[PDB]
């Protein structure tokens, strides 16, 4: 069933006991922290034997 | 609990796993901050069930 990704992430926040306005209010910060954290996965794997 | 949905003309809140549209009210919902912050918010009426009594 399709659902918008930021609206699915608001469900994942209810699933950890964080009220979903916390995601919609912090959405660009949460997106940047995810994008940055995936960048650290590239840099670790693109380096460490 | 539930998700906001529209049939194209009207706005309702449903539980997430079964289509059962409820009219959007102040006890279906909760407030946080103001409309300038949220990406993709839509303009609507929220019915307050106390207001018909204050209209007496
Ligand atoms: C969206 O849902 C609403 C349900 O209220 C529909 O509006 C109602 O339509 C019936 C006839 O189909 C009328 O008897 C009601 O009086 C209408 N209610 C309101 C609040 O106007 C609406 O037609 C639906 N829209 C679509 C595109 O399906
Ligand atoms: C949704 O995507 C459309 C283009 O498909 C864009 O114009 C619109 O600004 C986007 N809205 C939100 C809430 O991201
Ligand atoms: C929503 O309502 C406010 C106040 O009436 C208005 O300033 C704003 O432009 C509206 N936004 C949309 C997307 O219609």
Curated annotation (Swiss-Prot), chain A:
Protein name: Spike protein S2'
Task of the protein: Subunit of the fusion protein that is processed upon entry into the host cell. Mediates fusion of the virion and cellular membranes by functioning as a class I viral fusion protein. Contains a viral fusion peptide that is unmasked after S2 cleavage. This cleavage can occur at the cell membrane by host TMPRSS2 or during endocytosis by host CSTL. In either case, this triggers an extensive and irreversible conformational change that leads to fusion of the viral envelope with the cellular cytoplasmic membrane, releasing viral genomic RNA into the host cell cytoplasm.
Superkingdom, taxonomy of origin: Viruses
Gene: S
Residues of the full protein shown: 894 to 942 of 1273
């Amino acid at each position: 069933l399709q659902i918008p990704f930021a609206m699915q992430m608001a469900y994942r926040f209810n699933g950890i006991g964080v009220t979903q306005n916390v995601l919609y209010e912090n959405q660009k910060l949460i997106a940047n922290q995810f994008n940055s954290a995936i960048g650290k996965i590239q840099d670790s794997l693109s380096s460490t034997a | 609990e539930g998700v906001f949905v529209s049939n194209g003309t009207h706005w309702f809140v449903t539980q997430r796993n079964f289509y059962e549209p409820q009219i959007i009210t102040t006890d279906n919902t909760f407030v946080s901050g103001n409309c300038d912050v949220v990406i993709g918010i839509v303009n609507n009426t929220v019915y307050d069930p106390l207001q018909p009594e204050l209209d007496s």
